[PDB]
Ligand SMILES: Cc1cc2nc3c(=O)[nH]c(=O)nc-3n(C[C@H](O)[C@H](O)[C@H](O)COP(=O)(O)OP(=O)(O)OC[C@H]3O[C@@H](n4cnc5c(N)ncnc54)[C@H](O)[C@@H]3O)c2cc1C
């Protein structure tokens with residue numbers, strides 16, 4: 001009887017683990033799926049308007065992107081592609097017997113609160129039914145409703161216009177003049193793949209982002225431990241790793257002119273994973289314009305900054321991402337941003353969960369983050385967990401990023417899945433220094449798995465092949481300082497911490513780290529008059545590419561005092577070309593030898609074409 005009856009919207013990864021989690025706490029799942037098969041966005045249809053495209057592979061290694069008690073098969077590789085992922089989801093649904101609860105061809109239409117119960121409107125027309133449930137797990141994913149920007153004249157463009165959700169492979173670009181717009185992962189992969197077939201590829205973007213390949217050195221991009229992520233200096237570490245472990249890539253990244261500015265990295269600190277677009281841009285295979293499109297003529301495109309007119313455009317691919325606001329129509333009455341504590345639990349009745357939350361999950365795979373929410377909701381349903389009033393207070397904000405490995409620590413602690421810092425601090429610390437290995441979270445607490453330890457052991461043996469120990473030990477001292485003086489004294493007494501550790505924490509007091517919810521969040525931060533603007537812009541670009549401050553850059557100082565390099569000089573002139581479409585011939589710097597000599601030349605060349 002007490003089997004609670006939970007309505008799960010979706011058969012994708014979230015719905016699968018959401019159902020398997022409630023089955024561990026003896027509840028009864030009811031999955032409704034609009035499509036005819038499980039798998040989610042990893043399912044292709046023929047008139048494709050959403051869903052992963054052919055070359056898609058996971059950005060992060062299998063060691064951090066799959067479920068706690070169900071390892072992925074890496075025979076064909078550590079970065080799983082479309083076939084293996086949907087394979088995985090089907091294997092999971094079968095070991096934990098999830099198929100029986102799935103009702104395919106069944107679209108949820110409305111969810112309304114009904115006392116403490118929930119009334120759900122299922123199915124479309126003559127199959128329209130209505131059932132009642134104890135809780136609703138919203139597991140409908142993202143990336144389904146394209147977002148089309150409003151651009152002047154695009155509605156009258158006479159070429160083909162696609163949105164990336166329709167993309168499957170690059171045979172569609174063969175022989176064509178392509179304009180790719182947007183520089184998320186989709187724009188990156190499409191632009192890169194287009195550059196191996198198309199007649200010409202033009203890549204439009206407004207602002208530069210950080211790109212890493214899948215492997216950084218001889219380890220996956222995602223092998224980074226919470227301790228490192230806590231020294232903060234967000235990605236100063238990852239950048240160091242790149243610079244020290246991937247020097248060739250780092251020089252090539254610079255020469256592309258696509259390495260972003262500090263102001264750029266603070267504005268979006270999210271690390272995008274792509275393998276290849278930067279090499280293609282370096283080689284001239286792609287023509288990047290970092291600026292804003294002014295308007296679209298009938299078969300071409302005009303740019304605001306440079307005045308560039310690209311002509312005879314065959315295809316525009318709008319890689320402009322998704323409006324995920326409409327994926328929440330069946331709960332139109334609710335404001336997800338304002339009613340969901342942590343963007344995850346309906347504040348007045350958590351029986352209503354939003355598994356994906358509302359933020360951007362970086363650093364490791366999405367699956368184990370979803371799983372963690374699933375294990376947590378399973379306990380809220382059992383009555384074994386009652387969100388406290390600081391929990392209910394949190395609001396997921398627009399733009400925010402979630403450093404998953406931290407989110408799993410924060411949540412893994414609430415559920416008692418990690419050694420207690422107050423009693424097993426040394427162990428807690430080892431955990432904070434391993435990458436996000438999901439088997440770590442099934443060694444203790446609710447529903448462990450005996451085979452977990454051995455799984456976690458292979459992943460950690462691959463981790464062990466940089467330190468900043470000093471900084472790390474300072475994170476140790478500051479964590480400990482953050483536990484308080486009573487717990488510190490107790491750890492000292494019981495022999496968990498040495499006398500040095502204890503005394504240092506005693507000194508690192510006003511710098512104490514207290515792990516909390518927002519530990520896991522990152523918030524991004526953002527004629528004559530014309531000719532002054534040009535030279536001002538050129539100096540900044542020289543400042544960016546040189547790592548020098550505009551004070552030290554002066555009009556009449558010879559440019560060669562400034563210590564350029566082949567790499568930094570290239571980077572400096574591709575950046576010029578990207579914003580003003582001016583090409584610097586191979587003698588530009590032998591003939592113009594000061595800043596003022598260079599800007600006056602380029603501004604002339606600029607205005608001999610269309611300016612402003
Ligand atoms: C191109 C691309 C690449 C990606 N790469 C990665 C990656 O490398 N790593 C990673 O971790 N993640 C990646 N993701 C995203 C992430 O993997 C997916 O969101 C993941 O599958 C989790 O999906 P989900 O469980 O939230 O539901 P989804 O997989 O989004 O599917 C949701 C399901 O709910 C169903 N549904 C929706 N509305 C209703 C309704 N009203 N009634 C009934 N059913 C409904 C849908 O039919 C769908 O089957 C990528 C996404 C895209 C588009």
Ligand SMILES: NC(=O)c1ccc[n+]([C@@H]2O[C@H](COP(=O)([O-])OP(=O)(O)OC[C@H]3O[C@@H](n4cnc5c(N)ncnc54)[C@H](OP(=O)(O)O)[C@@H]3O)[C@@H](O)[C@H]2O)c1
Nearest residue numbers: 059149181182183184185186206207319320321322361366
């Ligand atoms: N952990 C994971 O591995 C994981 C999980 C989920 C999803 N993903 C990735 O998320 C991707 C889905 O999002 P997406 O990358 O397609 O889109 P996106 O990240 O939302 O970015 C859309 C792009 O379009 C540009 N754009 C938007 N509006 C524009 C306008 N009016 N004019 C010009 N440019 C505009 C944006 O640049 P601006 O900066 O100028 O806006 C942006 O680069 C998937 O491909 C997947 O790889 C990864």
